[PDB]
Amino acid sequence: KVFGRCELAAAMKRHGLDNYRGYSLGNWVCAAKFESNFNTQATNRNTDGSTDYGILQINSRWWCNDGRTPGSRNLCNIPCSALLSSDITASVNCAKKIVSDGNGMNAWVAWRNRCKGTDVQAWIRGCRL
Ligand SMILES: OC[C@H]1O[C@@](CO)(O[C@H]2O[C@H](CO)[C@@H](O)[C@H](O)[C@H]2O)[C@@H](O)[C@@H]1O
Ligand SMILES: [Cl-]
Ligand SMILES: [Cl-]
Ligand SMILES: [Cl-]
Ligand SMILES: [Cl-]
Ligand SMILES: [Cl-]
Ligand SMILES: [Cl-]
Ligand SMILES: [Cl-]
Numbered sequence: 001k002v003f004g005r006c007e008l009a010a011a012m013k014r015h016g017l018d019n020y021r022g023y024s025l026g027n028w029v030c031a032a033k034f035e036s037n038f039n040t041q042a043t044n045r046n047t048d049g050s051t052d053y054g055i056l057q058i059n060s061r062w063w064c065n066d067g068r069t070p071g072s073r074n075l076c077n078i079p080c081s082a083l084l085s086s087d088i089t090a091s092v093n094c095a096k097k098i099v100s101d102g103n104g105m106n107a108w109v110a111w112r113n114r115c116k117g118t119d120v121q122a123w124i125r126g127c128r129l
């Protein structure tokens with residue numbers, strides 16, 4: 001599923017991301033935009049051989065099992081393929097564990113580099129939330 005901006009915003013809010021660990025909804029939307037362009041099926045291989053999956057590009061090195069990432073963890077206790085569903089439930093719940101990990105949203109490279117400290121509020125402009 002390729003989510004619409006406001007559609008994803010609404011889905012993220014219902015799942016309780018809005019201001020989760022102090023991060024307003026626009027941050028989550030902005031992150032999704034630059035990680036996956038709102039595409040739940042987005043996958044990307046990392047240099048270290050691990051892979052990023054889903055709307056928030058969650059990494060198989062630490063958070064999910066894809067069966068081909070040696071010496072990796074599966075801290076969210078899911079197959080990485082669950083992160084690709086049109087139902088963003090798994091991605092949100094795992095993301096909640098990721099952002100709680102001590103570094104906040106800096107865990108998402110594209111967030112730090114492209115969203116952090118900008119008007120992320122603009123990402124939910126005109127949405128019925
Ligand atoms: O998320 C855990 C850990 O991995 C780092 C390493 O640079 O970022 C990775 O994980 C992200 C989210 O799961 C990926 O989007 C990214 O591709 C990947 O580099 C750290 O930010 C973080 O400590
Ligand atoms: Cl939309
Ligand atoms: Cl919650
Ligand atoms: Cl593995
Ligand atoms: Cl665990
Ligand atoms: Cl889908
Ligand atoms: Cl959903
Ligand atoms: Cl980046």
Ligand code: NA
Nearest residue numbers: 001002040041
């Ligand atoms: Na898709």
Ligand code: NA
Nearest residue numbers: 021022023104
């Ligand atoms: Na915060």
Ligand code: NA
Nearest residue numbers: 049050051069
């Ligand atoms: Na991998």
Ligand code: NA
Nearest residue numbers: 065072073074
């Ligand atoms: Na694993």
Ligand code: NA
Nearest residue numbers: 069070071072
């Ligand atoms: Na292993």
Ligand code: NA
Nearest residue numbers: 087088090091
């Ligand atoms: Na999901």
